[PDB]
Amino acid sequence: AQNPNCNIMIFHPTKEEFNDFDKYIAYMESQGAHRAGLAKIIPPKEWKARETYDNISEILIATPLQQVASGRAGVFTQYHKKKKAMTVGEYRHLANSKKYQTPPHQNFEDLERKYWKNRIYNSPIYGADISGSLFDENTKQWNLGHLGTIQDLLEKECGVVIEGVNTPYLYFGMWKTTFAWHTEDMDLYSINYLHLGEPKTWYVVPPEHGQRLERLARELFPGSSRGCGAFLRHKVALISPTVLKENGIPFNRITQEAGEFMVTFPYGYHAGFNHGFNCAEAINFATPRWIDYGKMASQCSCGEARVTFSMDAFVRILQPERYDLWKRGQD
Numbered sequence: 001a002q003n004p005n006c007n008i009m010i011f012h013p014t015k016e017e018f019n020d021f022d023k024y025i026a027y028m029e030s031q032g033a034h035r036a037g038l039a040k041i042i043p044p045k046e047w048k049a050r051e052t053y054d055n056i057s058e059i060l061i062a063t064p065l066q067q068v069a070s071g072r073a074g075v076f077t078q079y080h081k082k083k084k085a086m087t088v089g090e091y092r093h094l095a096n097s098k099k100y101q102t103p104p105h106q107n108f109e110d111l112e113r114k115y116w117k118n119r120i121y122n123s124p125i126y127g128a129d130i131s132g133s134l135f136d137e138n139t140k141q142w143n144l145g146h147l148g149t150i151q152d153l154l155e156k157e158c159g160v161v162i163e164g165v166n167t168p169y170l171y172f173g174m175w176k177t178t179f180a181w182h183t184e185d186m187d188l189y190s191i192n193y194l195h196l197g198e199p200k201t202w203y204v205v206p207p208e209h210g211q212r213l214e215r216l217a218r219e220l221f222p223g224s225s226r227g228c229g230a231f232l233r234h235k236v237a238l239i240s241p242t243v244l245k246e247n248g249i250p251f252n253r254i255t256q257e258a259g260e261f262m263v264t265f266p267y268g269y270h271a272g273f274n275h276g277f278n279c280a281e282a283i284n285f286a287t288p289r290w291i292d293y294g295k296m297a298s299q300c301s302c303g304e305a306r307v308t309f310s311m312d313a314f315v316r317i318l319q320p321e322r323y324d325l326w327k328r329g330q331d
């Protein structure tokens with residue numbers, strides 16, 4: 001069995017190996033990459049996402065979110081307070097202001113310590129889930145707006161044509177902006193490209209151990225758990241590496257830098273934080289190996305998680321018994 005310790009693997013494809021996305025994902029899995037839940041892909045030196053980032057300041061962040069924490073330093077929830085619209089240029093200036101800028105630090109480990117010690121005492125502002133792309137249309141390899149769609153994949157594997165579309169999203173981050181512990185909708189893959197700026201630190205639990213994380217989360221968030229059997233789908237719960245280690249949960253950590261891709265694999269729970277002003281682009285995708293995970297994915301039926309249009313068909317076709325209850329939670 002390849003990668004039996006479930007370590008995060010890092011790949012360096014050549015330009016020839018960068019031509020066929022599906023083939024290279026399947027190659028990574030042949031080496032056991034999926035067992036970690038997360039892999040890093042460093043693109044060939046010949047590749048670029050676009051020519052420059054000099055012309056992005058006029059992108060609008062229609063609904064910036066202030067991430068307000070409740071709890072203790074290693075175990076907290078966050079809610080998202082809506083703020084007034086601002087441009088990427090205005091947000092960048094805000095990120096770099098004294099109130100929000102990254103503090104002086106020695107290295108990534110020192111910044112991680114500072115994050116976990118101090119995150120709860122501040123409320124950083126995040127631009128999330130902005131439909132759009134920063135890939136040049138003439139970038140032909142690993143262009144996140146030109147991947148095969150999940151609806152086409154389900155049709156190819158299972159024979160059923162379904163409605164829906166699959167497009168990328170942009171994320172504008174600052175110091176302390178946080179992504180809570182979650183798997184993807186319908187336990188899909190994700191791919192994330194850090195276009196510019198400061199790093200992103202990731203934490204991940206191997207898919208084969210995901211239920212260990214869920215059990216700890218029910219213990220640490222007992223009211224949330226009573227409310228919803230799939231409350232991690234709400235994307236609000238944080239648990240520090242120190243707390244995970246105290247509870248014997250298997251996990252790994254890695255820092256993504258500008259110009260690097262990350263792939264999350266089906267049922268790989270992940271969380272993390274941004275180091276300073278940055279911009280990432282991400283999209284969900286599927287492969288033949290996803291289908292069996294999609295059929296078994298938990299679902300939030302309490303009202304809180306309330307998802308993409310295009311999730312309807314995946315629940316309807318892969319999870320017909322759950323469909324009626326799930327849909328009641330969407331109305």
Ligand SMILES: O=C(O)CNC(=O)C(=O)O
Pocket residue numbers: 171179190191192264270280281282283
């Ligand atoms: O860029 C982000 O905010 C974090 N993205 C994800 O959780 C992802 O790509 O799966």
Ligand SMILES: [Mg+2]
Pocket residue numbers: 055056057058059
């Ligand atoms: Mg612009």
Ligand code: NI
Pocket residue numbers: 182183184190264270
């Ligand atoms: Ni994710």
Ligand SMILES: [Zn+2]
Pocket residue numbers: 227228229230231233234300301302303304305
């Ligand atoms: Zn719920």
